[PDB]
Amino acid sequence: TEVTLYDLPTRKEEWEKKYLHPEFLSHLQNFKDFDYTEICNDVYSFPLFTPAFCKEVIEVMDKANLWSPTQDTQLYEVGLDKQWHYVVFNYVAPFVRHLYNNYKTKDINLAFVVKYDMERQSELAPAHDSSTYTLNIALNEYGKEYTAGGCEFIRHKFIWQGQKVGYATIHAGKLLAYHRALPITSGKRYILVSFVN
Amino acid sequence: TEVTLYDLPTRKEEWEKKYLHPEFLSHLQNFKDFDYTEICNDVYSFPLFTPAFCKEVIEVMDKANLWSKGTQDTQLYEVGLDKQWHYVVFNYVAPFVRHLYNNYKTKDINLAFVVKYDMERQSELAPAHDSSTYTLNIALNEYGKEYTAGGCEFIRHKFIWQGQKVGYATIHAGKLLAYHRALPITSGKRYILVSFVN
Question: Is residue B113 a part of any domain in this protein?
Fold first, then answer.
């Protein structure tokens, strides 16, 4: 049987091939040549996951229908928290060491999927996150499945729109990257957000 | 009798006149026009305390002789100044932080101590991320007159900061974005007040 989201780290090799973006995967040992973009001071956009990861994550959340000030479901509520912990400590933490002067990842505060729709935009007030760093993955396709949306970095005076499926944004949680989501004008927009200490 | 370091907030008004830099004091309600400098991205230098504050802090630490063995420091709580420092941070520093950093709200104080660098230090000052959301570093004594060299290297910014004025503070992020090391002094003694705030 084909590997599933749940099979990390038991079926590590197969999981990686199916779920991690080939560009990220091929640079695990050498981030010097990895194609990431500094979109504004100290905020990076980079390929992380494949379309298959994103599609399956959305299916799991849609099917669980455990949606909860924003409409979200914690990874622990669908039994994906141990998998996420593995992703963060094994794959993301070395990339953080590279980006941020050898900063060592301590622990995960929160990991959840957010579903923005036309009834549930949230307040969209600016905030500092409860984290040392925040990871934000776009799970579904701009234009095809939603319009407008995106992210405003208040301090940086920078608007980030049209994030690609499976691409991540990373930024400081507290102090230095005050931010808000932007409203969508149609459809549904799904993101995976994690608050890491 | 003249107000002392200990008399905050009992003798708040007299404490402020004696111990807070007049420029900081006069802008407590509106930092818009306060004369602070961005020395590198997101790192600010600004007047905070008077020479009298700095002199008295050093006296208290010199007299207590509670220095860690021989980097050499003493915690403010070891000389009974932790409640005064709490008052300083929540009442004076926190509003300035709200102004500098997009309304960030100060939660709690991790540590507050005085560091004494002298010529007995035998080993290296390694780079570090601090255990804090933000770090406050006050120069307590005078560059050139009382020590040579010293200062602080912001490694990510590739910026060396040296020769801070007495009673002037540096503020920077603790984690992630302001990797740093202290640089050794080559003569005399350098005293600093450092606080790690969450």
Answer: yes
